[PDB]
Amino acid sequence: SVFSERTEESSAVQYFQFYGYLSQQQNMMQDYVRTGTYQRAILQNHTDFKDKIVLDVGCGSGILSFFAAQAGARKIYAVEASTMAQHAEVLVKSNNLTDRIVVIPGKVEEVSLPEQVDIIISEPMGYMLFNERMLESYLHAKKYLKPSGNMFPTIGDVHLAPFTDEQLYMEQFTKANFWYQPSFHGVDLSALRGAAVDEYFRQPVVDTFDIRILMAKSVKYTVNFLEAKEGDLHRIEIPFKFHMLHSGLVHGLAFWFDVAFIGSIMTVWLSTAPTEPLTHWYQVRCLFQSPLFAKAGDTLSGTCLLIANKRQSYDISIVAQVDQTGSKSSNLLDLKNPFFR
Amino acid sequence: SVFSERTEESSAVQYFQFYGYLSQQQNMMQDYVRTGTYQRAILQNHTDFKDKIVLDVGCGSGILSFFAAQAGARKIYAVEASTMAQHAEVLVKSNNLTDRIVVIPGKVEEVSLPEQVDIIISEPMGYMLFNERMLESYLHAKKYLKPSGNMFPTIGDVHLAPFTDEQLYMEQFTKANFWYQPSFHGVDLSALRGAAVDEYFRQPVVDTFDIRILMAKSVKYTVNFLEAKEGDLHRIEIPFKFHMLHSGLVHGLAFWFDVAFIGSIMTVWLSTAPTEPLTHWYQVRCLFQSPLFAKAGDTLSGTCLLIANKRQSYDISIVAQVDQTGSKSSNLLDLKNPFFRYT
Amino acid sequence: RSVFSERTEESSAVQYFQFYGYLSQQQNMMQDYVRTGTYQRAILQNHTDFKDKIVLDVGCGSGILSFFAAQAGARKIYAVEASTMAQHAEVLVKSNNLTDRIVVIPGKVEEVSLPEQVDIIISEPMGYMLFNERMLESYLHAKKYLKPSGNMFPTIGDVHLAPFTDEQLYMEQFTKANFWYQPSFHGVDLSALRGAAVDEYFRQPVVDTFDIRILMAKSVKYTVNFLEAKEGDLHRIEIPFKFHMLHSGLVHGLAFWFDVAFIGSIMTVWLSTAPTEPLTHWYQVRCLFQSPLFAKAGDTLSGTCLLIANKRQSYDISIVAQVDQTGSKSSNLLDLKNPFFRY
Amino acid sequence: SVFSERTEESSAVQYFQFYGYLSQQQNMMQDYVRTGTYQRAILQNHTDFKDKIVLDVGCGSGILSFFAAQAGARKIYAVEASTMAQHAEVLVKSNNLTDRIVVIPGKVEEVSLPEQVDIIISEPMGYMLFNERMLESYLHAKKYLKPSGNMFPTIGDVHLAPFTDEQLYMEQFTKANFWYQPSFHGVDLSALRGAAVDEYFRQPVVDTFDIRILMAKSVKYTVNFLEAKEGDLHRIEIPFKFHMLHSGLVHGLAFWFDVAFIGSIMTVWLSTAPTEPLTHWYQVRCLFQSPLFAKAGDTLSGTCLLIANKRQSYDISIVAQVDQTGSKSSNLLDLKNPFFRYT
Ligand SMILES: COCn1ccc(NCCNC[C@H]2O[C@@H](n3cnc4c(N)ncnc43)[C@H](O)[C@@H]2O)nc1=O
Ligand SMILES: COCn1ccc(NCCNC[C@H]2O[C@@H](n3cnc4c(N)ncnc43)[C@H](O)[C@@H]2O)nc1=O
Ligand SMILES: Nc1ncnc2c1ncn2[C@@H]1O[C@H](CSCC[C@H]([NH3+])C(=O)O)[C@@H](O)[C@H]1O
Ligand SMILES: Nc1ncnc2c1ncn2[C@@H]1O[C@H](CSCC[C@H]([NH3+])C(=O)O)[C@@H](O)[C@H]1O
């Protein structure tokens, strides 16, 4: 199957084991912004659901399917690969919705549905939007979508912006500098100092921050889920040209994302921007090993290249340069091993 | 091989990916009690190392081998299965000990060593001592130990004691009761409340606590690494009969461990007890599904049975009863997936 | 052929005496009330050590100390000064109507000839970390003019060194050095020079003051007795130390200050530049380690601070320090001539 | 050599020791206006460099030569007399430019170049442009310049303008009046007040200021590096006739400078004017010993004479008079010892 071909078993086991825990479902569900925004998007666009066939990709507890049921859907296929599918069924029964919500245990790339659906719902977004590679399952599921069918969310915007945060930088450098010691309990560790810096700086920093650390208006990269195919997400090339609004050291790039539910009645946005209330996605920052100095008015240009890997994540390559001076930085990050700060 | 036969590959992948990080090695190395005590044990027992052949099981960065070198070891075979072996190789070279230290990449159950050693060193202890099941790798390596050889550490003591922590116990239900609401965004979640409670109680709690919550002097279970076999750790039955020092509700059992380096010159102890400075092992608490009331002077008896699984961990089965009243409580826990509670 | 010229690069000497030729610098020194007031106290409170005596003032500058000696009743004061400040001193001697008692002799104390032997030598020859500027050697050299039963003001000097913790200072220097870490400064890769840069920045003693609570152990004292010492004694100054750590943490380096004692017939007067005392224009001096050493309370931090005099009227400082319990060792080289004024 | 003949060894040693520090180089490199403007001037005039032979006089870290390399230069001879030459060589190697940049250690007046160059680049500007006397080295280097070769910078403009700053003026006496007290610790210092005032007014003041203190349009003195000789800078006479735009007291003359890179594609300016972003050169003010009153419309005429000395600096003689009243003022300043006032 498409899933297994692109996924190491070791990663898959851990991945679906992780989501088999009720506590994580709770963790996601208690994100009121997330859950509330999804419910708002579905219910205020009830006509996109009324008497329609729905596919819920990765239903987990089934919350989105219940939202779909509340909006008047005739029949909802709720596909779930982890052992959470069993608990979802329990909830379907206890809520007397057996006639409208149908749990399909298994991976969306592998199960069989009896019919084509009018709309696909899912919450497949990870850190930096693309982490976990579930967007590909979401897009893969379009094999079950009627020609003029719809998707909730409809589009996803990734925002990139340069930031300055010396304390974060030195915080990481401090950690790496442990390996700078010439005599740790009499042992010279210095020969590994380089490897340590690499390892620590390969970690995207997951957390939130004040918006004023941003040195330029963000650049936007849009994925249209109605149009995109799986393969489009195997290699994601995001070119950027920032017009610096402030002078200073650029320590790296900050990432967040929005998704839009473009329904018939209205468009509803779910945003993880640092200007918006905090969500469990927070924001993600990729550090440069060495910061770049730029004056206000300069242009910071380059490319963020995301390469999907078999561990359900991405190898991140960031190349950025101050055009006016030729000051250049290249960096490689492992989105699979982030730093929760 | 013995390792792969007792280990789910997925778990192994994850396991050796974990230790391939310099940050995790650093994490262990910066635990001053651990590292310093190992160094102390090795150097203060220099006659156990000077001109000796040494085997370092799971050398990681190679720190213990360097300690062995400082103590005067003639030849040190440093075995390491993760990609940390590469960095150890680098450090051996940069510290000009290539003539004394030989890094061997691979699992100790699978690599070939050329000769028998005088002493084996290792740090194979996990949560509750036994987690990660590396102790078995440590014992397995005794196929390379001379009949009159030594083990550093030489013995390992796991300590169990009954505790009272009303808030910890009630916490589980406070969290589980999230699901006990008839209209979470219009959804009745209550049918899953029981499952949520179960899930939380299956997790051993990793963190520390004030020693005053302990209601009896601990019971000790000793593994003598010089004498024990690998197989001895597949099923570990720890019977206990606690003499209660305080009256109250017993919510479960607290776990910690000590290891002793018994050298020719002296014995050095490394302790993770809650009476001692905190280590990266912290302490572990397993809850009873139902608390048991015990009076001071009463006896709390039962068994902690540790059953090794192929996920490099243990299923913990605890049965306990107050002998004076017959009040009985049990729990079953999955040590591979503990709850890190420490704040 | 003078000892001064033999031990001093001319380039350094020119600059050195030009520096002190400025009235603004004299003002700077004179306006340090602790210094000036304490000197006056030491001299006047021991007036009988001066009354009707012959005095030598080594490096009189503006001549203030000679005036103190005159106030104390000295019969004749030879005020030796090598810079052009000697002329300004003469002016003050005349305008203060003391031409009959204070005699300015322009030139280096190693080169001028005095008409007679003196009963007491006074001077203010202390530099940063006491020994900087190498004027103590001129002070000691001047003892060729001292009567057998003569005295020295100051009589002794105590250097105090103690380990400190100051993460922010360390990071402050490392941040500066990290400029040379850049792989593309305007398209230029500077990284190959980071090692040289870190060296250069950490080669600088930090001159300023600090909170006494950053000190992690009671100070160690090294005493120079000016009555007994020879010039040659200060070419190589070896200060061994063994600190008993009072606090756990990272030792980022050693902090230095000094006291001098005026041991007079009537009383002993102390001039202290310790961080517990009111600030002086000497402040305190800290030598950073390139890598801090972790030590817990109760540990011993031992080693040596070695000062080698150079021809630039300063010292090459080599500090070697080790945590005895762990063998964690740090070595450092500092250039006392080029310190970092942080205040 | 020409250099040693015009320079006291003392000054030269201090001078090249100063620039031997990576931190000082860093200080210059971190001046974004300076460095960035040089890079722009070179790169935006790429036709002046593409496949050309280049001489970098006093390359320091070698940054300008790397800029020349970025512009497509065939061969750059980078001459450097301090120990920074060692580090420059390192950077050429690590940047894989050994085939195009040749570091030549030594003074440009003493080294030999293998061939003639098409263009000379350098940053020889000091305070008020002429300080350090490096412009003479820059001009001296034209013995290696092909006829019709180019100079980057091509010209240097020194700007002089009368200013009013009552507080700056009064500050001098405020400081000098320290010596005007009849009993400083019992000593009458007053006889030296005059000398202290003199000393303070001999120091050019380095810092920046509000442009509204300027009382007339600046007068400009231009050095064309393509045409000028070394000897032209031994005696620099700058006559001035200022047409006062504001009424008030003139306390002295303010100095700044611009340099122009006149390339084939465009002319790029580097300015240190008080109307422009601040540089490490700041601006320089020379006070009159007595302020001059001028009405708006009056004419302030006179001369600024710069006489080069062997300390790699200038003796500044300024004479000015208000033509309408005959009110006259003079001052003599020592540019080698300026007062860094900037805060
Ligand atoms: C750590 O930050 C929190 N976080 C991060 C990412 C994320 N992603 C939502 C996606 N849900 C995943 C659910 O679908 C399930 N499945 C994930 N991939 C699936 C597939 N191919 N086929 C079927 N089901 C699939 C999975 O088991 C889960 O129940 N949600 C979060 O709240
Ligand atoms: C700069 O930081 C603060 N600080 C540090 C050290 C210091 N030392 C006093 C030294 N001045 C006393 C005078 O001796 C003079 N001379 C110094 N060496 C001399 C010699 N060999 N012969 C004659 N005079 C000599 C020197 O010119 C001075 O004017 N004073 C300070 O306030
Ligand atoms: N069977 C095995 N063979 C070889 N290495 C192993 C095995 N099991 C675990 N390890 C390694 O054992 C190490 C335990 S961590 C202790 C590392 C080091 N001796 C120190 O004291 O800091 C990890 O680096 C694992 O990769
Ligand atoms: N006569 C001379 N010959 C060679 N180098 C010199 C001479 N005089 C000064 N220098 C050097 O010239 C440099 C001036 S500083 C400018 C450094 C570098 N070009 C930059 O743009 O950052 C210093 O490094 C001095 O050591």
Our Rg estimate of chain A from Cα atoms comes to 22 Å
Please report the two chains with the greatest interface, counting residues with C-beta closer than 8 angstroms to the partner's C-beta. Answer: C-D, 42 and 42 residues
Question: What structural class should be given to the helix and strand makeup of chain A?
Answer: alpha/beta
Which homologous superfamily in CATH is the superfamily of the largest domain in chain A?
A: Hnrnp arginine n-methyltransferase1
CATH architecture of the largest domain in chain A: Distorted Sandwich
* Helix count from the secondary structure assignment of chain A: 9
The percentage helix of chain A is: 10-25%
PDB class: transferase
Keywords: protein arginine methyltransferase, catalytic domain, chromatin regulator, mrna processing, mrna splicing, nucleus, S-adenosyl-L-methionine, transcription, transcription regulation, transferase
Assembly: tetrameric
Entry title: Crystal structure of mouse CARM1 in complex with inhibitor LH1427
